[model samples]
Target chain A: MLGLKTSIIGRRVIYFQEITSTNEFAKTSYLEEGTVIVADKQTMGHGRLNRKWESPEGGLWLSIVLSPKVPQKDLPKIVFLGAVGVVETLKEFSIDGRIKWPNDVLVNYKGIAGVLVEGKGDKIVLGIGLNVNNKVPNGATSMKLELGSEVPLLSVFRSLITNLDRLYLNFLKNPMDILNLVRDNMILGVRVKILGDGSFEGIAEDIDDFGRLIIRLDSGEVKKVIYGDVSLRF
Target chain B: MLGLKTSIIGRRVIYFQEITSTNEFAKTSYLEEGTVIVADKQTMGHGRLNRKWESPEGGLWLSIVLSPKVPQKDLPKIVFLGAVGVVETLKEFSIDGRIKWPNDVLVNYKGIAGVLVEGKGDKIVLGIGLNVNNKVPNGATSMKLELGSEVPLLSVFRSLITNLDRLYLNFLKNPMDILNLVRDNMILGVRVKILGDGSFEGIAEDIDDFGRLIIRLDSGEVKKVIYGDVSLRFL
Candidate 1:
């Protein structure tokens, strides 16, 4: 945990050699808010909607405990704040990663990192899985695959917490800045299909303040898609 | 549990002679989503923010399980819907009750029933304590007191479950109906002090779609107060 430049984000670290899922483990703990649980590997890692998230040995699989104590309406922005944190960390590796709406970090149009946010009561646990130096799925790529070299694991962890703390500090008053950051980093002006409660084909549009995907549907209606599986339309 | 008029809201009932709190008991159970847990008395009944709610004998202390599986944003309205259900049930007794925003049933400006909504995972438990045929503290009224006669406990229970079932069914599509119903019944046209985060004096203007209290602050800027303890100025 040396060289970590964060004061409150990862101030208290619970390091695990291997665990089921960091989010599940962190949620049940009465640990101090803002503590982090980092693991070298995860046996039962999961993403949003309980999808399987591959967490091989050489990846960064971790979850951070956050208790913002704000209204539930303000909780959704934490996902984007986490994206800024991770994207800022990626810039340190000299690898440019773009943010997908909600909280996926893509490299060269393939996901290189993913974030899963869940909560019970006022506390939320954000689980992040980054494919640093491991073989990922076809639609996913790793930093090693892109950079042609192995990255120091500890460096990425420290960088992530430091960037997260700064962004989280600015979140209460300047949340729109994080939204603007995500908006600027996001890909737009493309046709796509949104798979949510009801599927529809639309042109990729900017995200709203509520983190909903605002799209112009094929039928000439501008609607905000709340939660969905989004894929590009070829 | 006899004569309960609900097919899904309270088809299966678990009765207890006495318990700590129905919500606390219901939250820990592995029962089906819509099961009902009833108790004759509560030793430690409490409402929102852990405030003590008097649950003496003869009062209806029960918790209903609800798992709508909708987006989290839509869950807060259930509290208002529960209030509407209770208000409608009071209408059956020839007693009028108005809903105070969030979850309070008021009869003649005094609280006759209170609702406590909490959640674990995706499941929500709404514990309701109604002052029926029981003596209550100051500023609280019971149904028997309002009706000026003894009311059958079973009848009130049956009517509440029935009204809740009907309102709960219309919750998904006609959720705006619940909002409209609350708005129509809510107290307005007055100055009030809202206590949350920090205190502010404002005119209780209207309720928005998200179930938050819309207030025009003293500064002349309209603001949405999310969660708070609200009290009338003259009270």
Candidate 2:
């Protein structure tokens, strides 16, 4: 029996008291490569750029240590894989949603959850933040609002983890199979704003071959927006 | 006072009475990037390839967690940096030592210690394993003999931790700097046998750019040796 005494997904869970950040906890280097770190509260928890990504109470923040021996350039696609996984989980609740660059899962207009990925090993320590339970962190919505008054927390967690695993498994079978799926789920018919000296008034197109976001600017200029965050002007 | 407790590195260290492997104990999908894991003794220590990396009695085995922000291609080099760091400690005794790729520190024809490096965060987890204060583990020699007289155990440990910090600082300044220094120190300049493929009659010139054993074969050909035992031929 090749059964080991570690995470077979949700089978092994170690509850934490307090941590700096779940991402920081999950990304610990000495670990066997892929271990999940979940904490009830993180005193130093914050989003990108040190913004208050608070987790006072009833907020879901965790980091997954992933050691995929894939090429470094394939890093960006990993984020795309996570986005699709979350969106698929929302579909079960009939909460129609779309993808946003870098982070943020949007249910129609209001932001619901966000994902952040940091690189380690040939793997990545992905810190996923969800506006689950309690009230919204800043100005966000929860699944309970859309799906009746009674929201099954455990059920949602199971479906979400299953969706993520399935998508991740597709990559092992054939990377292109998952990439094609990511490319297929690209945001369509959405207006976007780019941050830099100049701005781009274009339609959010597909993620290019190199995983860059493609956009057709107003001047009919076909441009590829790579690094900077591009989101709906609204 | 931002003392040792408030230092940037993760400070939580877990100790076990007798565990399978301390390094495995330190293994977490959820670590705060650079955490340190240390233990007195390991019942079932793991060697490279999961072999029984024996830790019978009187040995030091520690693993540190580091979350580095580097690409995968640049990851394995962390293991190389660790070997170099440990070499500084060994060199203190004037002992002629050699390093085996991925993670083995050898002394007096015997593999005395090893380090396992895994990239976490934007850094690397440097796992240190040394057979200090113990009898030779098959084809090995002890530092006790080379030190003229038996050395103080605490002094040896202090020297090790101190040497590690100094080397770690060099790494912090520029990781690649130590990376190069390490690739050079790996004993590559001798007529040697590349364990698997029989005798490799070549100039043990040096470990190459990617930490490969660059052997200029006797036939005027060069092959990059990346695996197996390498015995330095006394030609």
In model 2, state the lDDT of residue A123: 55
For residue B28, model 2's alpha carbon misses the true position, in angstroms, by 14
Q: Could you tell me every candidate's TM-score relative to the true structure?
A: 0.49, 0.48
CAPRI class of candidate 2: incorrect
As a whole number from 0 to 100, the lDDT of residue B13 in candidate 1 is: 60
Model 2: per-residue Cα lDDT over A58-90, one tens digit each: 555666666665666676677776677778888
Q: What is the lDDT of residue A84 in candidate 1?
A: 77
Worst 10 residues of 2 chain A by lDDT: A1-10
**Full-model lDDT, candidate 1:** 0.79
Model 2 error, position B109 (Å): 60
The weakest ten consecutive residues by lDDT in model 1 chain B span: B226-235
**What lDDT does candidate 1 reach at residue B138?**
98
- Tens digits of per-residue lDDT for model 1, B1-235: 0223455786556555566988998898776766777777789999877889998877898898888766777787888877887888888898889876668888988899988888876789988899888889999999999989978786788788888878878886566678888888777767777766567787888888788888897789998877545433322
What DockQ results for candidate 1? 0.01
Q: Against the true two-chain complex, what DockQ does each candidate achieve? A: 0.01, 0.01
